[PDB]
Design an enzyme around this catalytic site. Structure first.
Site, PDB file in Angstrom:
ATOM      1  N   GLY A   1      24.731 -11.028  19.877  1.00 50.56           N
ATOM      2  CA  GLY A   1      25.987 -10.335  19.917  1.00 50.56           C
ATOM      3  C   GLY A   1      27.012 -11.188  20.614  1.00 50.56           C
ATOM      4  O   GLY A   1      26.821 -12.394  20.776  1.00 50.56           O
TER       5      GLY A   1
ATOM      6  N   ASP B   1      17.551 -24.435  13.450  1.00 52.41           N
ATOM      7  CA  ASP B   1      17.795 -23.088  12.957  1.00 52.41           C
ATOM      8  C   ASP B   1      16.432 -22.498  12.635  1.00 52.41           C
ATOM      9  O   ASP B   1      15.930 -22.632  11.522  1.00 52.41           O
ATOM     10  CB  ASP B   1      18.724 -23.123  11.753  1.00 52.41           C
ATOM     11  CG  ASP B   1      19.180 -21.755  11.339  1.00 52.41           C
ATOM     12  OD1 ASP B   1      18.839 -20.777  12.031  1.00 52.41           O
ATOM     13  OD2 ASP B   1      19.934 -21.659  10.353  1.00 52.41           O
TER      14      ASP B   1
ATOM     15  N   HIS C   1      18.893 -20.676  18.735  1.00 53.27           N
ATOM     16  CA  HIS C   1      20.010 -21.137  17.911  1.00 53.27           C
ATOM     17  C   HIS C   1      21.146 -20.119  17.903  1.00 53.27           C
ATOM     18  O   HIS C   1      20.915 -18.925  17.684  1.00 53.27           O
ATOM     19  CB  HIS C   1      19.483 -21.377  16.488  1.00 53.27           C
ATOM     20  CG  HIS C   1      20.531 -21.696  15.462  1.00 53.27           C
ATOM     21  ND1 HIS C   1      20.874 -20.817  14.454  1.00 53.27           N
ATOM     22  CD2 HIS C   1      21.256 -22.817  15.240  1.00 53.27           C
ATOM     23  CE1 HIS C   1      21.798 -21.362  13.685  1.00 53.27           C
ATOM     24  NE2 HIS C   1      22.043 -22.580  14.135  1.00 53.27           N
TER      25      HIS C   1
ATOM     26  N   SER D   1      19.540 -15.420  19.864  1.00 55.98           N
ATOM     27  CA  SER D   1      20.869 -15.794  20.360  1.00 55.98           C
ATOM     28  C   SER D   1      21.001 -15.186  21.754  1.00 55.98           C
ATOM     29  O   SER D   1      20.029 -15.249  22.519  1.00 55.98           O
ATOM     30  CB  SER D   1      21.918 -15.377  19.346  1.00 55.98           C
ATOM     31  OG  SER D   1      21.559 -15.881  18.061  1.00 55.98           O
ATOM     32  N   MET D   2      22.122 -14.554  22.100  1.00 56.05           N
ATOM     33  CA  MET D   2      22.271 -14.058  23.467  1.00 56.05           C
ATOM     34  C   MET D   2      21.089 -13.194  23.905  1.00 56.05           C
ATOM     35  O   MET D   2      20.620 -13.305  25.041  1.00 56.05           O
ATOM     36  CB  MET D   2      23.583 -13.294  23.608  1.00 56.05           C
ATOM     37  CG  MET D   2      24.800 -14.198  23.588  1.00 56.05           C
ATOM     38  SD  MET D   2      24.499 -15.648  24.613  1.00 56.05           S
ATOM     39  CE  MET D   2      24.300 -14.907  26.230  1.00 56.05           C
TER      40      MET D   2
END
Ligand SMILES: N#Cc1cccc(CN2CCc3ncn(Cc4ccc(Cl)cc4)c(=O)c3C2)c1
Ligand SMILES: N#Cc1cccc(CN2CCc3ncn(Cc4ccc(Cl)cc4)c(=O)c3C2)c1
Ligand SMILES: N#Cc1cccc(CN2CCc3ncn(Cc4ccc(Cl)cc4)c(=O)c3C2)c1
Ligand SMILES: N#Cc1cccc(CN2CCc3ncn(Cc4ccc(Cl)cc4)c(=O)c3C2)c1
Ligand SMILES: N#Cc1cccc(CN2CCc3ncn(Cc4ccc(Cl)cc4)c(=O)c3C2)c1
Ligand SMILES: N#Cc1cccc(CN2CCc3ncn(Cc4ccc(Cl)cc4)c(=O)c3C2)c1
Ligand SMILES: N#Cc1cccc(CN2CCc3ncn(Cc4ccc(Cl)cc4)c(=O)c3C2)c1
Ligand SMILES: N#Cc1cccc(CN2CCc3ncn(Cc4ccc(Cl)cc4)c(=O)c3C2)c1
Ligand SMILES: N#Cc1cccc(CN2CCc3ncn(Cc4ccc(Cl)cc4)c(=O)c3C2)c1
Lengths: 178, 181, 178, 178, 179, 179, 176, 179, 179
Positions: D62, D156, D116, D91-92
Site C-alpha cells: 500500500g 520481481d 520488490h 511491498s510495505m
C-alpha cells in the site's frame, strides 16, 4: 489507421483478398462469419479450383458463427489452406483443422487449443450439449481421432505446440519459411 | 489527423507513404489487430521484392504475447532482411521484435529505453500454459542475443530498463546511431 | 437482512455452536474473519471440534492458503462440510479438514481444477510456485501422488460427492444425521 | 457481517482480537489503515509497555508514507512486537513484517513474501528518496548490506518463509505451537 | 471497521480524544475542519491550560479549510503539541509548524512539504495570490524565516527530511522512542 | 467517524448544540436550512434570552434556503453571535452579516465575499432572478447600513474581503485573534 | 422500512422466525442459501420434531444455492410445510415440491414453473440439469421421461395443475 | 471541421507540411511522436538541406515518446527551426530547446517551463524514473550550455519563464514580434 | 452537417476561408488555436497586405491558447478586421480588441466581456497572476486605457453593450447593415 498499397491501388486488406486470403483474426461473432463467408463465396466465384488461404489468429467465438464458417468451407470446392499464427483457440482451432488435408499449416511458435472455454441468446442445458456434440463430431472427422479421444482431450484446459497439434490431427505442416 | 503528401503525380497519406519506403511501423501496444496489420505489411513488402530489405520501427511498451509471437514468426518467415529500429522504448514484446531482426541490422537511437522483463496476455490462462509461453520467450531471447537460458532467465527477473549501449552489449541490438551512417 | 434468535443474531448464534461459515468467494477479508473466528474458538477450547461450512466457488489463493495454514495450526479437530459446491480454493479447504471428518451433502459439486492469487499482478514464475503448493496440499491431503493430482486438476470439471469421496477430498456423504 | 462473541460482555470479534493484543493488518496499507493501526499500537502500550503486541500481516503493500507511520509507531513504543505473516506480506507489508522485534518475527508455512516494490503525486527525486529510506530500513532489520538489499528488491518475485528467514525478514516458520 | 476498547467502553477514536488527541489524517476539507474545530473547542473547555496533541498525517487540503483549523489553534489557550507521522504536506505542514513553539514533533521516517500543489470555489487570480501571501506570512511567522526564504523555498517542488524540517523552522524535535 | 464525548453520552456535534452552537459548515441547501432552523427554534424554546452562536464556514448555497435561515434568525429573540472561520461566501456572508449588532466576529485569516456567484431550486425566469438579487441587496444594505448603490457596486466585484475590510464595510464588528 | 412488533421487541422478520416461518422471498443466491440454511438448522435445534414452515415467493436462482436449501431440507428431522404465494419459478418450485409430503401448499393465484430459465462447461451444466430431473421426479412421483418433457415447455402452471402434476398437495384459500 | 485550401486540393494541415512545417500542438503521446517522426523523415528525404520548422505548443507528454522525437531531430541533417507559441512545457520545451542553434524562436506572450510535472507508458521502478530524469538533465544542459547543477536546481522550481528569460537561460535564441 | 456550395465546389467553411474569413466560434483551446494559426499563416502567404476577417463569437477559452492566436495576429503583416456576433467574452474579447485599429467591429445585439472567469496545466499562484498581468498589458495596449482602468473593470463580473465596448477601447464601430 489502415494503409494503401499501390501498383492501380487497393488498401492492404483488400489487397490480401486479391491474393485469395481471408483473414480470420480475433473473436468470431456473427458479423465476422458473415464477412468471412462472403469472401469465401467471392473467391470460389473467381475460381472453382484455385486454392483459398485462411489465416487464423483467433481466440474463439460464438459457436454458431464459427459453424457457418466450417459449413461454408465444406460447401465450396476450392482446396483450402488454413494458417494458424499466434494462436487458434476454441472455434478457431476447429476452423484451422477444417482445412483441406495436407494444407493445415502453423507457424513455428503458435499455440493451439480445442478446449471450449466458459452464444447470442441464452440457451438450455441440452442445447449447449447438443452443440458440444457437434464439435466432437467435427473434430473426430478432421483429426481421425476417435470420438472418445476428442472428448477426453477437450476436457483438459491446456494448449498444444504446433507439433503436438500436428500429431493430434489438427495440423499437417509446421514451418519456419517456405 | 493524418497528413497527405504528393509524389505522373500521386498522393498518399503519410503512413501509406512510409510503406512505399518499405517501412512497417510497430508503434504502440501490441494486440491481435496490430499483428494482423503488421503481418499484412510484411507479406506485401516481400511480394514486392523478397530481397529488398524491410525496415521495422519499434516504439512500444509491450502487448499480448501470442500476438507478439505472430509477428516474430512472420519475421523469421519472410525472405527479406529486416532492419529493426528502436525509438522511444522497446519493452517486453517490443524488445523481442527488436532483438528478432536480422543479425547486425538491429538499431536503437541513443535515448531509447529497452526492457526484456515481462510485465506481471489475451484470454485467461492456466498456470502451466503461462510458464509454457514464458519458456518460449526465454528461448527466443537466447537464440538472438546469443545468451544462455539461465542468463536470459535471470535477466528478465530484474524489473528494469537498459540503455541502448547496455542492450547492445547484451545481444539485443548491434549498432547505436546518432546520425545517418 | 439478518435476523435475531433467543439474545443473538443468527450468524453470531452459529458461532456459539462453533460453526465457522466460509460462504461465497474467498478474499483477504473473508480470510481475516475466518482466521479470527478459528483463533477464538480454539481459546474457548483446544479440543472441542470446530465445524467449517464450505459453500464457496473459490477465491484468492493467498487468502485461501492462510485459512488453510490456520486450520493446520489450531489444535482442534475440524469438521469440514460442503454444501452447494466447493470449487477451486474451497475444495482445498474441504479436503483439509480432519481425517474422517470431511463431509458433503448429497447434491453438492466439488471441483479441484483451478480457474483462469488475484491481489497484485504477479509473474509466471510465481503463479507456478502457487499451483505447485496446491499440488502438495492436495496430494498431501488426498493420499494421491503429485502425478495423480496434477492430472486431475487439469480436467475442467466437477465431482459428485461420492466421486470426491473416492478420490480423497472427503470422508462421508450424509443424507440425514448418521 | 462481523460476528459477536460474549465474555459477560459483548465484543465483536475484532474488538475481541484487540483485547488479546492483536492488531490486524489485513489488506492494503493506506492512510486510514495507518491511522487505525497507530491508534491500537498506542492504546495497547498505555495498557502496558511490557506486554507484547502481536501484529497480524496479510497485506500486498500500500501507500508508502502510510506504511512508514506504522513502521515508526512500532519503533517508537516499548512493547516487544511479534509479527505474523500469514497468506502474503508484500511491498510495505513485508517491511512491517521484518520490522518486528528480533526473535519474534514469524510466518506460517504457505505464506509468500515479496520485497520488490510495485510500479501525493511526487517528483522523481522524491521517489528515490523514499526508496532509499526503504533500503536503509530493510538493511537494518535483515542485517544485509545496502548492496545485498538493492539487488534483491529489484528482482520481481516472492520468497517462501525459509528464504525470507535465510535473509533476515523472519526468525520462525511454524506449523503448530507446543 | 473501528474497534471498541474498555466501567465504560469507547470506540478507539473516541478513546484517543479522551487522551486529548485530535487527529488530522488525510485530505483537509470543510468537514475535516468543522470536526477538528469541534474537537479543539472541546478540549479547551475541559481545560484551558492542558496540552492538546494534533497527530498530523496529511497531504494538505482546502486552503481556507486549513486556515480555519489554524485560526482556532491560535485562538484557543491550550498549548498544542504537533506530531507528524507519514507525511505532512501543503496545509498539513502549516498545521505542523503552527503548534506551540518547542512542541512541534515528527517521527523519523516522515516527509514534509511546504510547496503548495496546483479552493472551495474557483475565484480570480488576485484571490489565489492573497491566499498564497497569507501562507507566506504564516510560514514566515512560525519558522521565523524571512518572506523571501519562505517564498524561494515554496517554489521548490520537493519534500524535507524531518531533520531539514527542524533546521528550517517547521518543527522543534525528531524523536525515535518516548523520552 | 464522529467521536463521542462524556460527562451522559454525547456525540461532539450534539455536545456543541448543548453549548448553543449551531454550525453552518458546508454549503446551504434546503436540508441544511431545515436542520439549522430546527436548532435555532430549539435553543430559543430553551431560552429566548440566552445568546445563540452560529459558526459559519460556507461557500454559499441555494438562495431561498439561505433566506429561510435569515428569516428564522430575525424572528428569534435571542442575541445571535455569528463567527466566520475559513470563509463566508455569498449567502454565507449574508447570514454572517445578520448576527445581532456588535456580535459578528471573524477570525484573522478568514475570507469574505458578497459577490453572488453565477444555485437554484427549479429553473426560473429572469425577472425572478432580479426579484431575489434585489432582496439580497436590501438585506445587505440593512445590516451594513451602506446604501443600495454602495451594496450594488460592491457585489459586482468578484473578490474577497479581508476581515478588517469586512469590519469597515459593515459586514462584521470584531476581528479577534484569541478569546 | 422494516417495522417493529412487541412481545420482547423484534423486527417483524425476526418475529416470523420465532413462529418457525423461514422466508424464501427473492431470487436465490448463495447468501440467501447461507441465510436459509442457518435458520433451518436453528429451528431444528429448538425442536427437531416441531414442523417448520417455509414460505416461497421466488423467481429462481443460482442452481447450486437452491440445491443447498434442498439438501438442508432433506437433512433436518423436522416436517416442512412449503407455502407458495406469488410464484415458484425454476429452483423455487423445486424447493416448493421438496416439502414434506401432504404439506406442500399454494395460495390460489400463485404461478408455478418447473422450466429452467435459459460460468461452466456443457457436460457440467447437464450433470446439474440431470440432478434436477431426478429431484423433481423424486417428489412429484412422476417418471424421469415425463419430468424431462414437462420441464421442456416454457409455460407456468396453475396451483391446480401443479397439484395434479405432483408439485404440491393442497390449493387453499382460507385456513382449515 | 478542417478546411481545404487550393492551388490541387489541400487540407490546411497538409498545406503546412508542403511548407515544411511540422506541428506539435497538443500533448505528446506515442502517436504524436510517430506522426511527427514520419513528417521529419519525409521532409528530410525531400531534401537534407532545407530547414524544417517545428511549431511547438505543448503542455508536455510521455517522456519516452518525446525522447523519440528529440532523437529523430538530432538524427536528421536539416537545420531545424523551433517556434514556441502559446507554451512549451516540460517535454515540449526540451523539443523547443533542441532546434538547431540560433534558430529557436518564441513569440512574445508565450510561456516556457522545464519543470517536470509529477505521464508514463507502463508503471516503472524508482531508479528508472531517475534514469529518465538524468537523461533530461543531460539533454537540457547540452542545448543550454548550462551546467548540470544549474539545470537541476532550475527544473526544481515549479514556475514558467518569460521568453526573454528563456532566451537568457539557453532555451532559445530569438524572441520576435513580427517577421 | 456541413453544406457544399459551388468549375469548383467547396464546403461552406472552406469557401468562407476563400473570402479570407477565419472563424473563432466557441471555446478556445489548443486545437482551435493551431487551426486558427494555420488559417492565419495561410492568408498572409496568399497576400501579405490583404485584409483578413476574424469572426468572433466565443466565451473565451484557454489563456495560453488565446495568446498564441493573439501573438500570430500581431506577427502577420495583414490588416485584420474583427467582427463580433453573439458574444465575445474572456480571451475572445482580447482577440476582438486585438484587431487592426479602426477595423474592430461588432453587430448590434452582441454582449462583450473582459472579466475573466474562474489553464492547460494547473500551475502555481504566481503563474496565474503572470497570465493575468499579461492580459492587463494587452488590454491596456489596444484600448489605450490605463493599467488601473483595465484592472478595476476586469474585477466587475458583467458584460458590455457593443456601445460601451466601443467607448472603452474594445472596438471601433457598431454596424447594422453594410456601409
Ligand atoms: N449464408 C450463406 C451461404 C453459405 C454457403 C453457400 C450458400 C449458397 N449460396 C446460394 C446462392 C448463391 N448465389 C450465387 N453464388 C455465386 C456468387 C457468390 C458470391 C459472389 Cl461475391 C459472387 C457470386 C453463390 O455462391 C451462392 C451460394 C449460402
Ligand atoms: N498469418 C500469417 C502468415 C505468415 C507468414 C506466411 C504465411 C503463408 N502465406 C500463405 C499464403 C500466401 N499467399 C501469398 N503470399 C504472397 C503475398 C501475400 C500478401 C500480399 Cl498483399 C501479396 C503477396 C504469401 O506470402 C503467402 C504466405 C501466412
Ligand atoms: N494471521 C495470522 C495467524 C493465524 C494463526 C495463528 C497465528 C499466531 N497467533 C499469534 C498470536 C496469538 N495470540 C493469541 N492467541 C489466542 C487467542 C487469539 C484470538 C482470540 Cl479472539 C482468543 C485467543 C493466539 O492464538 C495467537 C496465534 C497468527
Ligand atoms: N500519529 C502519531 C504518533 C505515533 C507515535 C507516537 C506518538 C506520540 N504520542 C503523542 C501523545 C501521546 N499521548 C498519549 N499516549 C498514551 C496513549 C495513547 C493512546 C491511547 Cl488510546 C491511550 C494512551 C501516547 O502514547 C502519546 C504518544 C504519536
Ligand atoms: N468555528 C469556530 C470557532 C473557533 C474558535 C472560537 C470560536 C468562538 N466561539 C464562540 C462561542 C463559543 N461558545 C462556547 N465555547 C466553549 C465550548 C465550545 C464547545 C464545546 Cl464542545 C464546549 C465548550 C466557545 O469556546 C466558544 C468560542 C469559534
Ligand atoms: N421554519 C420555520 C419557522 C420560523 C420561525 C417561526 C416559526 C413558527 N413556529 C410556529 C410553531 C412553533 N411551535 C413551537 N415552537 C417552540 C419550539 C420550537 C421548536 C422546538 Cl425543537 C421546541 C419548541 C415554536 O417556536 C414554533 C415556531 C417557524
Ligand atoms: N451447510 C451446512 C450443514 C447442513 C446440515 C448439517 C450440517 C452439520 N452440522 C454439523 C455441526 C452442527 N452443530 C450444531 N448443530 C445444532 C445447531 C445448529 C445451528 C444453530 Cl443456530 C443451533 C444449533 C447442527 O445442527 C450442526 C449441523 C451442516
Ligand atoms: N523512428 C524512427 C527513425 C529515426 C531516425 C532514423 C531512422 C532510420 N530509418 C531507417 C529506414 C529509412 N528508410 C528510408 N528513409 C528515407 C525516407 C524516409 C521516410 C519517407 Cl516518408 C521517405 C523517405 C529513411 O529516412 C529511413 C530512416 C528511423
Ligand atoms: N505557431 C506559430 C507561428 C505563427 C506565426 C509565425 C510563425 C513563424 N513561422 C516560421 C516558419 C514559416 N514558414 C512558412 N511561412 C509561410 C507560410 C506558412 C503557412 C502556409 Cl499554409 C503558407 C505559407 C511562415 O509564415 C512561417 C512563419 C509561427
Amino acid at each position: 489507421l489502415i494503409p494503401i498499397v499501390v501498383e492501380r491501388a487497393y488498401d492492404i486488406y483488400s489487397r490480401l483478398l486479391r491474393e485469395r486470403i481471408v483473414c480470420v483474426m480475433g473473436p468470431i461473432d456473427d458479423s465476422v462469419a458473415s464477412l468471412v463467408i462472403a469472401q469465401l463465396l467471392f473467391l470460389q466465384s473467381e475460381s472453382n479450383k484455385k486454392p483459398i488461404h485462411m489465416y487464423i489468429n483467433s481466440p474463439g467465438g460464438v459457436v454458431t458463427a464459427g459453424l457457418a464458417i466450417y459449413d461454408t468451407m465444406q460447401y465450396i470446392l476450392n482446396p483450402i489452406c488454413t494458417w494458424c499464427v499466434g494462436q487458434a483457440a476454441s472455434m478457431g482451432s476447429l476452423l484451422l483443422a477444417a482445412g483441406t488435408p495436407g494444407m493445415r499449416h502453423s507457424l513455428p511458435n503458435s499455440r493451439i487449443m480445442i478446449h471450449q472455454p466458459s452464444t447470442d441468446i441464452a440457451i438450455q442445458a441440452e442445447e449447449i450439449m447438443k452443440l458440444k456434440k457437434q464439435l466432437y463430431n467435427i473434430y473426430a472427422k478432421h483429426t481421425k481421432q476417435s470420438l472418445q479421444v476428442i472428448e477426453s482431450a477437450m476436457e483438459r484446459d491446456r494448449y498444444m505446440s504446433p507439433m503436438e497439434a500436428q500429431e493430434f490431427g489438427i495440423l499437417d505442416k509446421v514451418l519456419v519459411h517456405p
